[PDB]
Amino acid sequence: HHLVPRGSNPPPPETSNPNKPKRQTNQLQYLLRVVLKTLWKHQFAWPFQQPVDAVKLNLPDYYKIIKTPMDMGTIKKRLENNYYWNAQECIQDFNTMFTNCYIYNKPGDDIVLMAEALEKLFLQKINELPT
Numbered sequence: 001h002h003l004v005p006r007g008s009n010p011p012p013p014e015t016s017n018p019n020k021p022k023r024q025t026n027q028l029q030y031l032l033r034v035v036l037k038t039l040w041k042h043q044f045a046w047p048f049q050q051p052v053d054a055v056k057l058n059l060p061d062y063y064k065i066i067k068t069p070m071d072m073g074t075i076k077k078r079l080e081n082n083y084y085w086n087a088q089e090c091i092q093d094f095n096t097m098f099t100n101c102y103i104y105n106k107p108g109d110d111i112v113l114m115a116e117a118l119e120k121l122f123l124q125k126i127n128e129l130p131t
């Protein structure tokens with residue numbers, strides 16, 4: 001088809017675990033209802049709300065470089081489906097999302113500023129987690 005590499009996309013990350021028993025917790029609830037909701041509405045959130053489309057965003061080699069993709073849409077779905085055992089698993093996924101941005105992009109890029117601002121807010125919000 002193409003004369004320059006355009007890339008391709010993996011299926012989005014899994015968002016449910018059919019073997020996992022349900023275990024609801026206060027911190028997981030707070031993560032879904034307060035932390036993620038606050039992050040989602042931040043002015044710089046939109047690029048992180050859905051999986052990277054390597055083809056449409058013209059980032060052909062994105063999924064060569066990023067072996068563990070992550071986005072806020074996926075994190076939201078994982079919280080909704082009770083995929084996470086604890087807050088730390090969720091936090092790890094946020095960390096994977098931000099660090100993927102830092103890995104793929106150059107330190108001076110606009111997208112990295114946006115990720116850094118979101119990460120700073122995230123770190124503030126996780127200090128609110130209930131006992």
Ligand SMILES: CCN1C(=O)c2cccc3c(S(=O)(=O)NC4CCCCC4)ccc1c23
Nearest residue numbers: 047048052057059100101104105110111114
């Ligand atoms: C967060 C996922 N993500 C990237 O890592 C990335 C790199 C380059 C552009 C871009 C875009 S984009 O909509 O093509 N371009 C810009 C639009 C607003 C300034 C920062 C990036 C969306 C999501 C991205 C990227």
